[PDB]
């Protein structure tokens, strides 16, 4: 698995691969690591995918309830606080390292969450087995105040560099663009024997028509 | 102490005064009918008319199903009914979880009358102002029908009616009911006793609601009669 | 609670005429680093009682808050000088605390000395007590004095001289060789200086920047720290 995040001109771009492994084999060839927290906050992470799914759903719905109660735009620092308390309370055994990104009233800001409950705002990061391959070319090519197209091209540089290099990462490349108003989720961004009837034998049959 | 309501406390005569007022609340409610038939068990009832803008489609407010093989008719307050419906469904699925077979209706009604008896005895909380006509099928005893009350009393009935004008309905059931009878005859008798209890010569299709439970084809299922089916039944009743 | 990290070395306590004398090096070692060379390791609970320390510093600090605030509660329910709690009271309290923490298995990595004066017929300091801010010495019978000890395991006793740490081999030997009764202040301080010199010359965790405290009729006297003559 390979994940990345990036801060750009008044926007945030996340990126991730589309492959999951169940050991040395691959289960899903077109998975979705990117997940929806809010209309202006998204996330993606690496670890135990059940922990990622449950924690992300919990954060999503808690943020929705908080927005409905307060009637104010959701904030990334709040999501960081809930995640850090959640992972610190459960002793770090919930191994789920998450790249958090969003665009609140204080402008775009990307965050990197770790298993033990620590966090750090960064302009760019990458997590997973193929992290290093991606984030090397990120820091090779990263600049301040890009255009959005340059950010997406660099995100395919990172995640397509990690797909070609790392064995634990592969498949399509996901991109999502987060903005103060509206968002975009490009799921397929880049994308780099019949037997005759009666062939098998049987010894029982029972048709049950459905009402 | 000074603001106590004296709920769980005997009368001078040994009645507690609270289940009695609950039963007067039951007697003012809309009537419900119960019948056991060779083909099934029936729980017809009478809608109270709130407004013509109520959704006629669905909105079965009197008869509810606890499981695929158990269903009951309410004869009192609807909120106290519905919380006990939820408890009944919980007990049914809990027994199926524990034992991997459907719960007999006798066990279930014992559980509801036990929990109703608890608030009558323990604590200082008011009793549930609701009486059910619980019915269903099991292999142990077949089609059964019961009559629960706020006191935690239950008793088996081949056919009974509760609520307002229950005396007239029970008189019609005593006059007309037979040991072996068809589902259609039971439905027609349900319309007859509902019309007699409601002080109407011809029952109104919008004012009533019917249901039946049959062990057809070795798989029990419940049917809830729609407006067109009740219209056909009333047409047959007028013809008969 | 789980193991020692920042450790003090040792203390020595001896009773003599006019009171008792307790001494300790001002240093707390972070293993083999010696991070702190100016630390207050001898504490005061009230007049006529002090608390020693050789071990983990966090536990001594926790016991210092407990003991000094027990003294605060004693003052807050005081009406006469005799109502002040004696060193036997505090020594038993620390012994019970160590025993309870042993039974729970959450010990204190310390070896405490509680010592002072268990009598009130010698001074009128406690009738009007002065916590914040602050003649001739009156000779004190050894029976009216008290020195105690508390081990990790809660083991306790009383004697005319008690030491902790590595001083239980060097300084205890020198005391058993040379300790008399009713020695003056000069002889006692000479003996303490000789024992601490022997410790400094053969103990890494010790030092020469010594604190010396006395508990007499005048009360607890924190003298100026001095480097040993060597």
């Amino acid at each position: 698995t390979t994940i990345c995040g990036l801060v750009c001109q008044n926007a945030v771009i996340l990126g991730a691969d589309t492959r999951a492994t169940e050991g040395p084999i691959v289960a899903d060839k077109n998975c979705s690591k990117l997940h929806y927290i809010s209309k202006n906050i998204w996330c993606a992470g690496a670890g135990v995918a059940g922990d990622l799914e449950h924690t992300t759903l919990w954060l999503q719905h808690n943020v929705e309830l908080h927005r409905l109660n307060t009637n104010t735009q959701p904030r990334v620092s709040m999501c960081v606080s809930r995640l850090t308390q959640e992972l610190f309370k459960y002793q770090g055994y919930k191994v789920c390292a998450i790249v958090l990104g969003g665009v609140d009233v204080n402008g775009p800001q990307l965050y990197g969450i770790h298993p033990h409950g620590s966090s750090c705002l960064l302009p760019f990061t990458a997590l997973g087995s193929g992290s290093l391959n991606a984030m090397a070319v990120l820091e090779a090519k990263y600049r301040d105040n890009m255009t959005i197209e340059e950010g997406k091209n660099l995100v395919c540089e990172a995640i397509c560099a990690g797909i070609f290099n790392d064995l634990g990462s592969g498949g399509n490349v996901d991109i999502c663009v987060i903005t103060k108003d509206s968002y975009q989720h490009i799921r397929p961004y880049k994308e780099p024997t019949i037997y005759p009837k009666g062939t098998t034998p049987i010894l029982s049959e029972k048709i049950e028509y459905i009402k | 102490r000074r603001y106590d309501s004296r709920t769980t406390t005997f009368s001078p005569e040994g009645r507690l005064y609270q289940v009695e007022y609950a039963l007067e609340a039951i007697n003012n409610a809309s009537i419900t009918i119960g019948l056991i038939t060779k083909d099934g068990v029936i729980l017809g009832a009478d809608k109270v008319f709130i407004s013509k803008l109520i959704d006629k489609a669905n909105n079965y407010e009197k008869i509810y199903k606890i499981d695929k093989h158990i269903f009951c008719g309410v004869a009192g307050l609807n909120a106290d009914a519905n919380i006990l419906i939820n408890q009944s469904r919980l007990y049914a699925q809990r027994y199926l979880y524990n034992y991997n077979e459907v719960q007999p209706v006798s066990q279930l009604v014992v559980q509801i009358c036990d929990i109703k008896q608890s608030y009558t005895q323990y604590g200082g909380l008011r009793p549930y102002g609701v009486s059910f006509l619980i019915g269903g099928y099991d292999t142990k005893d077949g089609y059964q029908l019961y009559h629960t009350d706020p006191s935690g009393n239950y008793s088996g009935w081949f056919a009974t009616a509760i609520g307002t004008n229950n005396l007239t309905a029970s008189s019609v059931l005593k006059q007309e009911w037979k040991n072996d009878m068809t589902l259609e005859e039971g439905l027609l008798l349900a319309l007859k006793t509902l019309a007699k209890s409601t002080d109407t010569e011809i029952p109104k299709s919008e004012k009533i609601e019917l249901a039946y439970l049959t062990n057809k084809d070795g798989e029990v299922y419940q049917k809830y009669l729609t407006e067109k089916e009740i219209e056909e039944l009333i047409k047959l009743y007028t013809q008969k | 609670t789980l193991g020692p990290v920042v450790t003090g070395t040792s203390v020595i306590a001896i009773k003599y005429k006019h009171g008792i004398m307790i001494a300790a090096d001002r240093k707390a070692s972070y293993g083999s680093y010696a991070k702190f060379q100016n630390v207050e390791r001898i504490f005061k609970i009230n007049n006529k009682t002090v608390m020693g320390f050789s071990g983990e510093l966090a536990d001594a600090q926790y016991l210092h808050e407990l003991l000094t605030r027990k003294n605060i509660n004693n003052l807050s329910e005081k009406k006469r000088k005799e109502d002040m709690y004696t060193p036997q009271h505090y020594h038993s309290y620390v012994s019970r605390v160590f025993y309870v923490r042993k039974n729970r298995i959450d010990p204190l990595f310390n070896n405490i000395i509680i010592a002072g004066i268990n009598s009130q017929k010698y001074d009128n300091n406690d009738d009007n007590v002065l916590l914040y801010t602050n003649e001739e010495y009156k000779e004190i019978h050894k029976d009216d004095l008290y020195i105690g000890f508390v081990d990790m395991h809660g083991t306790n006793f009383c004697d005319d001289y008690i030491t902790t740490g590595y001083a239980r081999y060097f300084a205890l030997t020198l005391l058993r060789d040379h300790y008399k009764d009713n020695m003056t202040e000069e002889e006692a301080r000479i003996l303490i200086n000789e024992c601490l010199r022997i410790l400094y010359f053969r103990d890494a965790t010790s030092s020469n920047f010594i604190q010396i405290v006395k508990v007499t009729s005048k009360g607890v006297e924190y003298e100026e720290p001095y480097i040993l003559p060597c």
Partner: protein, 208 residues
């Protein structure tokens, strides 16, 4: 721990037709079986099926927990329950014992209703022992014999397919997978649900 009561499940999709299949073994001490009827497939709703593979007691306990929750949902809502709702609820139940979990790797196979007439969309997904959901849109495999099934399906899957060809495909994939696993096999059953009907068939497998 999954060698003790080794098992396998499988499920494919097609053109208005869906299939699910399993082995009928129940093991004990890995290398000696005790039954040849233990079906890992459990019907749960008129158009939802679930395949539980792993420890047998955990399979049964999870079946009764889900049956309790399901039948509660149809009784309260008074309507048939959806595949996605069951999948999410299953993932929540498997996560609810994140520590000391049920040693079972389940799957879900069924139909998705899109009312407007009505269209039956195939639906398939798989889970870890915690609820690591992953939508797949084609063949889904889970169990100790998962690798052999992954190898068979890509060679043998032909995208959308007729229900007869789907039955041949899934049967050959399962039989070739189970023959290469020693602790999994002893017969098979193949359930091919369609909106009109469901066909349940048992295969003349190498049950020996």
């Amino acid at each position: 721990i999954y060698n003790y009561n080794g098992g396998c499940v499988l499920g494919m999709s097609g053109s208005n037709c869906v299939a699910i299949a399993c082995d009928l073994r129940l093991g004990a001490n890995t290398f000696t079986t005790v039954s040849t009827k233990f079906s890992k497939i459990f019907k749960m709703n008129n158009n939802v099926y679930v395949g539980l593979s792993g420890l047998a007691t955990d399979i049964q306990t999870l079946y009764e927990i889900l049956r309790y929750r399901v039948n509660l949902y149809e009784v309260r809502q008074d309507a048939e329950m959806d595949v996605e709702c069951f999948a999410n609820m299953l993932s929540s139940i498997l996560y609810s014992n994140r520590f000391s979990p049920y040693f079972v790797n389940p799957i879900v196979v069924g139909f998705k209703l899109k009312h407007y007439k009505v269209n039956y969309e195939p639906y398939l997904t798989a889970y870890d022992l915690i609820g690591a959901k992953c939508e797949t849109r084609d063949f889904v495999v889970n169990g100790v014999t998962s690798e052999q099934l992954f190898g068979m399906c890509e060679s043998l899957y032909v995208k959308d397919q007729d229900e007869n060809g789907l039955f041949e495909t899934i049967s050959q994939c399962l039989l070739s997978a189970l023959d290469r696993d020693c602790i999994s096999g002893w017969g098979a059953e193949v359930l091919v649900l369609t909106p009109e009907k469901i066909i349940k068939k048992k295969l003349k497998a190498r049950m020996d």
